């Protein structure tokens, strides 16, 4: 019974080691909005006579 406890305690230490890490690479990334209309600013002015 003592040997079973001692070996289990040793096995607990051995199991407590790390394997790897995982994380997501997201910094420096933004979204892209979409603009449908070209912002032209031209306005045409014509006289009443049309000349």
């Amino acid at each position: 019974e003592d040997m079973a406890k001692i070996y289990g305690a040793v096995a607990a230490v051995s199991k407590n080691v790390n394997s790897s890490v995982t994380y997501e690479v997201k910094r420096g990334t933004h979204e892209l909005i979409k603009v449908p209309t070209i912002p032209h600013n031209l306005v045409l002015i014509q006289s009443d006579n049309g000349k």
Binding site: Y7, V10, A11, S14, S19
Partner: protein, 50 residues
């Protein structure tokens, strides 16, 4: 065809962990299976026939 097999149980074993440590817990459980762990003396003289 015929064959003889020694069962002796089946035990899971993992990787990344030292095998000697894992063998310790199975060794104790094996001794329980064979009735070896506690101090003993064999008494098999009377089991016979003529």
């Amino acid at each position: 065809h015929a064959l003889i097999k020694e069962d002796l149980g089946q035990w899971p074993v993992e990787t990344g962990i030292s095998l000697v440590n894992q063998a310790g817990v199975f060794a104790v459980q094996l001794a329980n299976k064979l009735g070896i762990d506690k101090p003993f003396v064999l008494d098999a003289g009377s089991n016979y026939f003529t």
